Amino acid sequence: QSIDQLIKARGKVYFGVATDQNRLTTGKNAAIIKADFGMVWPENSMQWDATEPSQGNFNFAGADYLVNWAQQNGKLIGGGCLVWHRHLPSWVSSITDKNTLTNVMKNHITTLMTRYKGKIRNWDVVGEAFNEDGSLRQTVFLNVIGEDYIPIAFQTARAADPNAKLYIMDYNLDSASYPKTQAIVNRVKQWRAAGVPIDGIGSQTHLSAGQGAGVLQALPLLASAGTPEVSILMLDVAGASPTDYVNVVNACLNVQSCVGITVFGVADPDSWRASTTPLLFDGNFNPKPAYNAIVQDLQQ
Amino acid sequence: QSIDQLIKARGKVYFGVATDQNRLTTGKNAAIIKADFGMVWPENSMQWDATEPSQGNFNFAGADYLVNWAQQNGKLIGGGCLVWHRHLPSWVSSITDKNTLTNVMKNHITTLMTRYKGKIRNWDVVGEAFNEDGSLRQTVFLNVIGEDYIPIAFQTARAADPNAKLYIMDYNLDSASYPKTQAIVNRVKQWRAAGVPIDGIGSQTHLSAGQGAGVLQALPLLASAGTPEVSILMLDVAGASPTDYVNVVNACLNVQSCVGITVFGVADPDSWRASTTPLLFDGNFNPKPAYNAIVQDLQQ
């Protein structure tokens, strides 16, 4: 049974997955995505080092492949991450002039979003902007532009494609009593009160065994920032316990503004932490107990 | 034991594998390649549709990642395929002018080879140029430029990087009685006698169960064309029988000019034909019996 169909029947938008061209041409990934998932995200093909490896000179072949495949197969598309420190070519992080970096950042945002205008439901505009203690992470963007880089990024994105839902994303937002969770709420409330067009908070949910239960309290806390949407992004769970996965799904169901869940790949051997077997399909592309538990939870 | 180390001890150059960036950042692929393989080959990041999706718009982020990784980890690198009718963008196949297509082909070859000059041991310059009956395949290059496109491609490649071994590659060269196998031998002989710089024939070896034995006769036939080198390229075997894999390895050992073997990926779930489980590691990244049989054969 399709978990995307079942989550749509419960009033949500999607159950999605990260993928890219060489996943769609190998394994059983394309067949599983066609049958069971409703949204695709680029695993790597829209990151900055993949798309703008020298200034103004874009690499779109990989991203175009994904967008085309999704349109042919009737899937929604997400995109990201537009502004991020972790996937950033050296030419960017070596700029020291505020005006120049602002224009580089706006050109990167506008070029990607314009190319796919109207085709992308969600964009992750800014990612991993917070330290664990809730202060802003001192990346090249913060150091050179200042905290205004976040408002500027979102304003620029809204102008490039008004159809898209604009997200900030981060990880370690999985516990309601962890400082980073309340900090992103505090700052997103302030930014929205200043008119910054942040439509969503995306929680990049990488859990250890037993941590699913805490998402039931963390996700409603994230929703208290008042964004129109929240999502669970790039979900995986070490051990892939049915209990952990069902708890995350039920947190989504319990939060009215949570539109859906994306998992960080199809099958365990293709995970960035494969030894923890953290996904919903095994190395032979069979659905694991957690997959079947999600099916039953969405019916029950 | 490392099959690359063992094949080197038998006088060969490499046991290699196809890979690309997202493979290296997921699963156990990087650890296995470091320990057990001596050469990497882009699974897709150097094809024409990946590298020049529109005229003059080169996309090298993926290929650059692979080349860097290989240099940092002391691995040989192969590249290709430069001229091929598969993976060719529509902008190329819609050219009807002989001078224009000649210069487009030259520029594609020269740009890729120049970027990595000195770093790439082997380039597959022309691929899949023959029909199954041994006549030349009527691709856009044959139709518009004529038969001299093959001499031109090789002469352009030799000028771009004289350090590289230049290969022609094809598939279904696995039986000595098949017309294609004899045809490529005859044509390569005559091209080399006329000074065309073809250094190698690469046999793209995609086998069904039981076909390994035929390679013991086919590979010597390919070597009779007199090229400095031959190789086994992108090897996989439906069912991954030890008998089939050992027969292919022994064909390599028996042919003095065969420099090595590349396998078409690490683990079964990442194969283009994963349901046939045709690789040397399983979906849990454990060596399969075929891996251990190769080790035993090479020790003896």
Residue numbers in the entry:
A (entry chain A), B (entry chain B): 4 to 303
Authors' description from the paper:
HG3.17 was evolved from HG3, a higher-activity mutant (S265T) of the in silico design HG2 that was engineered post-design to reduce the active-site conformational heterogeneity observed by molecular dynamics analysis of HG25. Over an evolutionary trajectory that yielded the HG3.3b, HG3.7, and HG3.14 intermediates, a total of 17 mutations were introduced into HG3 to produce HG3.17, resulting in a catalytic efficiency increase of approximately three orders of magnitude. To evaluate changes to the HG3 conformational ensemble along its evolutionary trajectory, we solved room-temperature (277 K) X-ray crystal structures of all HG-series Kemp eliminases, both in the presence and absence of bound 6NT.
One of the key active-site mutations occurred at position 50, which was mutated twice during evolution, first from lysine to histidine (HG3 to HG3.3b) and then from histidine to glutamine (HG3.3b to HG3.7), resulting in a novel catalytic residue ideally positioned for stabilizing negative charge buildup on the phenolic oxygen at the transition state. In all enzymes except for HG3.17, the unbound state is never pre-organized for catalysis as both Trp44 and Met237 adopt conformations that would prevent productive binding of 6NT. In addition, the His50 and Gln50 catalytic residues in HG3.3b and HG3.7, respectively, adopt a low-occupancy, catalytically non-productive conformation in the unbound state that cannot interact favorably with 6NT. Interestingly, the non-productive conformation of Gln50 in the HG3.7 unbound state (26% occupancy) cannot stabilize the cis peptide bond formed by residues 83 and 84 via a hydrogen bonding interaction, and accordingly, the trans peptide conformation is also observed in this structure (25% occupancy). From HG3.7 to HG3.17, no further changes in catalytic residues occurred during evolution. Yet, catalytic efficiency increased by approximately fivefold.
